[PDB]
Amino acid sequence: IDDSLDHFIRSGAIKATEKLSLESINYVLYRAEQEEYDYSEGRSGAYDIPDYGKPVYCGLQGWVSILRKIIFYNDLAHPLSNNLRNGHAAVDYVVNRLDLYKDKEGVAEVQEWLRSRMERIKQLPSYLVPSFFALVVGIMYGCCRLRAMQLMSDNVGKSTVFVQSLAMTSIQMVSAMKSTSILPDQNIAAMAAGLPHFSTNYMRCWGRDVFISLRGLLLTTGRYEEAKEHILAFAKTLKHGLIPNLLDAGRNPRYNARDAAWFFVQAIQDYVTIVPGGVSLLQEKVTRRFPLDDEYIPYDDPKAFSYSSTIEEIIYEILNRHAGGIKYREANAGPNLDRVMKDEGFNVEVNVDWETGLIHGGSQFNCGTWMDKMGESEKANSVGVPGTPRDGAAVEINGLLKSCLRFVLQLSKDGKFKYTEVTKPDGSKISLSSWNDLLQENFERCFYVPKNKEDDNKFEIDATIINRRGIYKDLYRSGKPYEDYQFRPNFTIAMVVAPELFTPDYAAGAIELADQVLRGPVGMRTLDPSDYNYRPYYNNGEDSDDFATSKGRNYHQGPEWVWCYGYFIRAYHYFNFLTNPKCQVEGSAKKLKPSSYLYRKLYSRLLKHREWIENSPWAGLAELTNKDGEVCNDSSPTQAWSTGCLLDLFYDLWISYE
Amino acid sequence: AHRTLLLRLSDSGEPVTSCSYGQGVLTLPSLPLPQGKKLGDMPVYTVKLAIPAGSPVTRDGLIWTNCPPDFSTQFDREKFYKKIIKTSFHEDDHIDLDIYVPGTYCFYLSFKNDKDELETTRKFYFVVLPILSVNDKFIPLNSIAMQSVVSKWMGPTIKDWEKVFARVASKKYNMIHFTPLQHRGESNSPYSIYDQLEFDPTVFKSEKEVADMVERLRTEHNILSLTDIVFNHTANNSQWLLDHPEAGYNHKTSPHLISAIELDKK
Amino acid sequence: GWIWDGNPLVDFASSQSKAYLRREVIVWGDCVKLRYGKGPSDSPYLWERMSKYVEMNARIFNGFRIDNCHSTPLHVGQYFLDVARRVNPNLYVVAELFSGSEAMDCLFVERLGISSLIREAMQAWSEEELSRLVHRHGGRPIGSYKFVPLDDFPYPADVKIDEEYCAYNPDDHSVKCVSEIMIPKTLTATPPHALFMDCTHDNETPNQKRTVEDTLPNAALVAFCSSAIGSVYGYDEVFPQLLDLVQEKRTYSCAENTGISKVKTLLNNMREEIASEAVDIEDSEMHVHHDGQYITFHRTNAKNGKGWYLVARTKFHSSGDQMLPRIKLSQTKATFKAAFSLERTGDAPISDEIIEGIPTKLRELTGFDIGFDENTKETSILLPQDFPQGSIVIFETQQLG
């Protein structure tokens, strides 16, 4: 110890983080042990602290999540404190693990600073190592966290801890790997669905999760060049006019996702709206590594890189082939894809009822929507029975379709979209504006459930199968018609993406019920608690005979999901600002801005989320919660859409009122 | 708002110099337009001309300027507009000149001689600088950093050109100078232009292809583009030189060079 | 082509000249001179062709750059720039203009509507010549006088008054009067704006004319001027030799962040912060000092006390060790911003299909001592003896009061 040691430990950390990137910061702060194994061939992983366990990340966050409470109470008796006195192994671990990432941008310089300081720490008496270890880790952590805020956009860089803690999940989820990627020919940055189990090999990338999260994690933060690459990487995998959910790095993906293609085109609109010059995305040319029809997996055939498709025609191809109709049994169908799905479930069909203009699809043997839990309990007799098949008109799918139509209409107006016709299965043509005004007229009719019995004669209502009035149906003419009239948070997605389809008073009053019924403390209840099928506890290990709960069929009927809370409160915001006058105030220059009464309401519904990300060993939000905030031991501890959809809300408020 | 300047004139209609900055030009300040407003919405600047009371120019005095009197009216260098000079022996006259579009404007005075003839002062020019925005980020003319790049050394592809764009955008230039992008003549120099009316076919296909690349520079890298323009000559192998040899100096057009032709042919 | 020392205002292919007969032409057989007459009536295709030529690029680009604009006839240049301005009213016109005098240079800017004249820094023959060049385009002197209406103005009793100087909205972007009496800001002849190039595509590379080290101080000196700046690609990339526009076909190297590239990133971003803090000619002051192979540049805003101080040890030649006296700044506080040294690491690569610059080390420097006497309020600035030729340091300064 000398008077210069003090200045040595607190200096040089900002210069070390200089050449870092929002990608490379992932390798310094996070990296789940499974993500670490991916780079270490299974050799390394997370440091096992004796009489304690391992930090949840191999990076500095793993240390910080433990050290914060230790520094606060001076817990010199903590197992980590003891271990840091008895040896220099945790001291060396911090430095050595970066050998795995020494080649990535700025890590070599960060590693040298850590190395230079750690070596000087080891030359101290054993009882002084813990404090200097925690001090050095804390300093480099902050500088990396600062670098993240500098690289991200203003709205993130000037915000509260809670907003920044949300934004750091974008770094948790976006990294390059060795076992998987988003492109087949390269290994590049690929957004995981969540940590730790949705991070490696085929389990990492999921098209539904990528694009639902793309706006929040990538656009709200400013990672545009990373949002583009994820969009283009799925553009290559378009087939059946649909986007796959199981992106196998663009190498034999699974196409049972009726949802992904419309969240995909939604993100494209979000990209174009937000990115300065984002219209440039439309003319971007992509190598279409599949055929224009829908043949079969030919990843090695020379027809892979055969032809090119611009995002312009890629958007149109989704719209056109959807109208013209799509018929196909999934390629390579059989057990080698789903060892529990029945033979008729691999047959997926989707078309448009042109008397309404909305989109129907699926069956009682399918899981085409985000609620895609397939049962498997042999003892409970549910092998092959989808827990929530959502066949027919799904609210979001059509709401997302209206958003797409509204997008391409105003787009062609500006000379950026050359398409106007659309071919029907017979041979008819319909303008996009005609299809648009079709949904505008028929949507709220087919989906609303009036509060007054008098109005049932106008909204195609079968009052025998109802539960609550003043609601938008979850589905339209499905398989089980009582599943049409279930209160589910899914309708909030359509309210967010295409609010033109909703009359303000109906949407306002409907979402006030979700506030009283479907809104948990952190999660959105996936099913009205008054329904008979309501089972809000999810055990993917239950062996018993219960037809509902065994092998986790409850996944989408009761359990409280967090990413739906994002789409909910975004609409809760929009329609409480349009409807209730107490939620409005004459903002500067008389433009309409929300009042403190509305802000106070939004604030009270995010406290339980701030509490969660604060007291979470993984510095993020769970993917799922059991009834009334109870921790679901099978829920992923950090998920992308869980945080990316709260960021969605903050960007709304920012991009509109600040 | 207040976007007016005072251009005092002498008793002979010459502009008064307020400070000695050296030999210069009557340039108005480089300023962005007000909040969210277009060139049509308001006069860019207002030049208030001050005429001295009882000066010789006040006798039937008129101000003539090629400054269009409306935003709708286009600018013709040779079309001038009349403004009457309010004659007083005690009070000066002031004459606003509303300006709606950047460019070069000029003004002179006409008055009645001491022989009751019509006399005219010299033309006096003043300049309105353009308003350079990149993405609604105003760029003052004194903060421009321009990169000169020669296209025939930027590789053969548009994709091979955006590599140079990103390199200079990292060095934080905000404007790129483009050596002429048209089909070059025999000796392949960028300034000897084969055809001035379409671009280099080795890299470009249509006018839209270059306008989109230039716009791509504007939105992805916040960089503005400008090109060389050659007026003094064309390349010695223009396909239109055969259809139009009079655009140069011939034995027909410029006969004095006949004595000079037979000196090179000898 | 061009006559040797001839007036560029005289068409040497016209009746008033015998230069083709008398052989006084240095010629370009490459290009063929175009004959505009007294108007379009004298060459109706050429005028119609050039018009659509102008009108095409005016739809695309943001402005023009006119080669040997002095040799272009006046009425011609006026006609087409007016045509372009009808297409692109925010047209930015640049010109390498060297007519017979400054008065004529100003006359061209008047009638053509030129927005900036091009000035080159590589034309400097010695350290002082550069310092003068930099003094010309550096700004006004520090502590320079400001203009007020005095006893040469009428004071109308009914003149509008901004009592307490408070009738200017920062978003109206108004032209502020000198004080409370609202006598409008005076339209006075100012010198035409300059675009200072540290090196053009017609200039010999610093390797050729001086050495490669000057690429750092030269560019810093130019960038500290109160004007638009510019550079050719390869100057920062430290190319070894001026590219022949005719013969060469090699391609720009993809080697990123070479030579000065990191410094021009700093400079331009540094000038981006200064942005709209200086509008009229008296808002940006300066002080340039020449001492041997050192050149000092102090840049000052006349309203706010912020400033930047550049010490540049130039390398025109390897001219030995020279020690600069302690820099003294009265009633000013200084702060270290950045410092760099450029040193050549062997000769340039020899390639046939790609043009690559000279390998350079952009070494960061230390050892600068900034003493401040809390009594006399005088900041002293000392340089380290490790300050080789081709190095710069930049200080942020701030006047007190």
TrEMBL record, chain A:
It is found in: Cytoplasm. It comes from the Eukaryota. Residues 169-647 form the Glycogen debranching enzyme C-terminal domain. Coiled coil: none annotated. Belongs to the glycogen debranching enzyme family. Multifunctional enzyme acting as 1,4-alpha-D-glucan:1,4-alpha-D-glucan 4-alpha-D-glycosyltransferase and amylo-1,6-glucosidase in glycogen degradation. This is Glycogen debranching enzyme. The chain holds residues 870 to 1527 of 1528 of the full protein.
Automatic annotation (TrEMBL), chain B:
Belongs to the glycogen debranching enzyme family. The chain holds residues 3 to 268 of 1528 of the full protein. It comes from Candida glabrata (strain ATCC 2001 / BCRC 20586 / JCM 3761 / NBRC 0622 / NRRL Y-65 / CBS 138). It is found in: Cytoplasm. The gene is GDB1. This is Glycogen debranching enzyme. Residues 47-135 form the Eukaryotic glycogen debranching enzyme N-terminal domain. Multifunctional enzyme acting as 1,4-alpha-D-glucan:1,4-alpha-D-glucan 4-alpha-D-glycosyltransferase and amylo-1,6-glucosidase in glycogen degradation.
